Swiss-Prot record:
<protein>
    <recommendedName>
        <fullName>F17b-G fimbrial adhesin</fullName>
    </recommendedName>
</protein>
<keyword id="KW-0614">Plasmid</keyword>
<comment type="function">
    <text>Essential fimbrial adhesion factor that mediates binding to N-acetylglucosamine-containing receptors in the host intestinal microvilli, leading to colonization of the intestinal tissue, and diarrhea or septicemia. Also confers adhesiveness to laminin and basement membranes.</text>
</comment>
<feature type="binding site">
    <location>
        <begin position="43"/>
        <end position="44"/>
    </location>
    <ligand>
        <name>a carbohydrate</name>
    </ligand>
</feature>
<feature type="binding site">
    <location>
        <begin position="116"/>
        <end position="119"/>
    </location>
    <ligand>
        <name>a carbohydrate</name>
    </ligand>
</feature>
<dbReference type="GO" id="GO:0044406">
    <property type="term" value="P:adhesion of symbiont to host"/>
</dbReference>
<keyword id="KW-0732">Signal</keyword>
<keyword id="KW-0843">Virulence</keyword>
<keyword id="KW-1015">Disulfide bond</keyword>
<dbReference type="GO" id="GO:0043709">
    <property type="term" value="P:cell adhesion involved in single-species biofilm formation"/>
</dbReference>
<comment type="similarity">
    <text>Belongs to the fimbrial protein family.</text>
</comment>
<dbReference type="GO" id="GO:0030246">
    <property type="term" value="F:carbohydrate binding"/>
</dbReference>
<feature type="binding site">
    <location>
        <begin position="88"/>
        <end position="89"/>
    </location>
    <ligand>
        <name>a carbohydrate</name>
    </ligand>
</feature>
<dbReference type="GO" id="GO:0009289">
    <property type="term" value="C:pilus"/>
</dbReference>
<keyword id="KW-0430">Lectin</keyword>
<feature type="disulfide bond">
    <location>
        <begin position="53"/>
        <end position="110"/>
    </location>
</feature>
<keyword id="KW-0281">Fimbrium</keyword>
Length: 176
């Protein structure tokens, strides 16, 4: 059994976050290592129980403008892009996203003869694609994509909500 207990619209990263780096940035694309700072995490989005089996699919809607180490660089503006990870609750379990199709981002688990929950997480890292004289780049709130629970091994969502969405909070990049 399962029920939706989270939120449909979720903001990624703190509003007006400030991200800076002391790294030179001589060769692009340059990735800001913001760790999991620009992210959203919730260990409790659906409640499940009684042998329910569920995993997660993820989908990014931003245009793909290239890749880095087998993971797509999604474009936000001509100068800024993102690397994106979606997956189970723990940020560490994030699956590097590529493409714009629904992708398996959490292989899943089966809750035993008890009650528990299924959560999720998303984090992104900003990428400098093109130079700028101002050195500073501000990004506006922007839709990223979505995550959907994937019941398996017989389990079924029924009419319980399966998808939640994500928006990137605005932020600024400050190249020291
Ligand atoms: C080994 C272990 O702790 N197993 C169960 C946990 O998986 C379970 O936690 C839930 O795991 C899901 C899949 O990893 C997460 O999506 C979900 O957010 C997480 N929920 C919480 C509250 O941490 C816990 C809790 O029911 O029980 C264990 O038996």
């Amino acid at each position: 059994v399962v029920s939706f207990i989270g939120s449909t619209e979720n903001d990624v990263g703190p509003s007006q976050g400030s991200y800076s780096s002391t790294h030179a940035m001589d060769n692009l694309p340059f990735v800001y290592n913001t760790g999991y700072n620009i992210g959203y995490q919730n260990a409790n989005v659906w409640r499940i129980g009684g042998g329910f089996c569920v995993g997660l699919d993820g989908k990014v809607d931003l245009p793909v403008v290239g890749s880095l180490d087998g993971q797509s660089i999604y474009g936000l503006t001509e100068e800024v892009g993102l690397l994106i990870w979606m997956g189970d609750t723990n940020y560490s379990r994030g699956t590097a996203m590529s493409g714009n199709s629904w992708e398996n981002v959490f292989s899943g688990w089966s809750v035993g003869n008890y009650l528990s929950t299924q959560g999720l997480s998303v984090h992104v890292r900003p990428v400098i694609l093109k130079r700028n004289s101002s050195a500073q780049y501000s990004v506006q709130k922007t839709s990223i994509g979505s995550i959907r629970m994937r019941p398996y091994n017989g389990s079924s969502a029924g009419s319980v909500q399966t998808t939640v969405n994500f928006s990137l909070n605005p932020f600024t990049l400050n190249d020291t």
